[PDB]
Amino acid sequence: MTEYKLVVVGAGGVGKSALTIQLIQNHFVDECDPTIEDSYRKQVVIDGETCLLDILDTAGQEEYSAMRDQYMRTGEGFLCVFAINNTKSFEDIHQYREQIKRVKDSDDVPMVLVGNKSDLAARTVESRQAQDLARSYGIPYIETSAKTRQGVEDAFYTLVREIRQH
Ligand SMILES: Nc1nc2c(ncn2[C@@H]2O[C@H](COP(=O)(O)OP(=O)(O)OP(=O)(O)O)[C@@H](O)[C@H]2O)c(=O)[nH]1
Ligand SMILES: *CC(=O)N(C)CCN(C)c1ccc([N+](=O)[O-])c2nonc12
Ligand SMILES: [Mg+2]
Ligand SMILES: [Mg+2]
C-alpha cells in the first residue's frame, strides 16, 4: 500500500502528541507524559487515494543527538510544530528546519509549519509572522488545535501533498 512516512518535530510541550492522537484516534489528550518516540499507523483516505500514514511522534528535547537522528532519518515528511503562545518554540523552528535538512542530507525536504493551540487566546506569535516565516522557507503554514480539532486534518494532509509533490 501507498505509505507516507511522517515525523512530528518541535519543542517540548507544543502539542505534537495531542495533534497526532487527535488524528490517529479522534480525541484530545491532556496528561503529564514526557514523550519519547512512539509511532502510530492508520489507513486513511486522502483525495481519493487510499494510503497508510506511519507517524513518528518525537520527544521535545533541548539537546540534539545521533539517537534522535537515527529515528528521524526514516521519515519522508516533517510536521514542524510550535505553540502560538510559546515564543521560544517558534524561534526553535529555524533549528529544526536546519536539523531536518542535515539529517535528510537535502535542500528540499517535504515540510509544513504548524502553529498549535489555536483555541488559546492572548497569542504571543502573530499569525502574519509565522505565515511570513513559512513563505520565506517556501512551505505551507497551517494553524491548529489538538483541542477543538480545527486544522488538524489540514496540517497532516497538506504534508502528504508536499510528500507527493517532491
Ligand atoms: N489548549 C490546548 N492545549 C494543548 C493543545 N495541544 C497540546 N496542548 C496541551 O499542551 C500540553 C503539551 O502537549 P503535548 O502533546 O504533551 O506536547 P509535546 O510537544 O508532545 O511535548 P513533548 O513530548 O514533551 O515534547 C498538554 O497539557 C496538552 O494537553 C492545544 O491545541 N490546545
Ligand atoms: C508532570 C511532570 O512533568 N512531572 C512530575 C515532572 C516534574 N515537574 C513537576 C516538572 C518537570 C519539568 C518542568 N520543566 O522544566 O518544564 C516543570 N515545569 O513545572 N513542573 C515541572
Ligand atoms: Mg509528546
Ligand atoms: Mg519544497
Swiss-Prot record:
**Outcome of altering E37G?**
No effect on interaction with PLCE1
* Effect seen on changing G12S: In CSTLO and CMEMS; also found in patients with oral squamous cell carcinoma
Q: Topology in the membrane? A: Lipid-anchor
Task: Give a GO cellular-component term.
Answer: perinuclear region of cytoplasm
Source organism of the structure: Homo sapiens (Human)
List residues, modification N-acetylmethionine: M1
Q: Which disease is it linked to?
A: Costello syndrome: A rare condition characterized by prenatally increased growth, postnatal growth deficiency, intellectual disability, distinctive facial appearance, cardiovascular abnormalities (typically pulmonic stenosis, hypertrophic cardiomyopathy and/or atrial tachycardia), tumor predisposition, skin and musculoskeletal abnormalities.
Record-listed GTP binding positions: 13-18, 29-35, 59-60, 116-119, 145-147
Effect of substituting A59T: Loss of GTPase activity and creation of an autophosphorylation site
Q: Which family does it belong to?
A: Belongs to the small GTPase superfamily. Ras family.
Gene Ontology MF: a single term: protein-membrane adaptor activity
Glycosylated at which positions? T35
According to the UniProt record, list the residues that bear S-nitrosocysteine: S118
User: EC number(s) in its UniProt entry?
Assistant: 3.6.5.2
In the record, the effect of G12D is given as: In CSTLO; severe mutation
PTM summary: Palmitoylated by the ZDHHC9-GOLGA7 complex. A continuous cycle of de- and re-palmitoylation regulates rapid exchange between plasma membrane and Golgi. S-nitrosylated; critical for redox regulation. Important for stimulating guanine nucleotide exchange. No structural perturbation on nitrosylation.
> What name is this protein filed under?
GTPase HRas
| Regulation of its function | Alternates between an inactive form bound to GDP and an active form bound to GTP. Activated by a guanine nucleotide-exchange factor (GEF) and inactivated by a GTPase-activating protein (GAP).
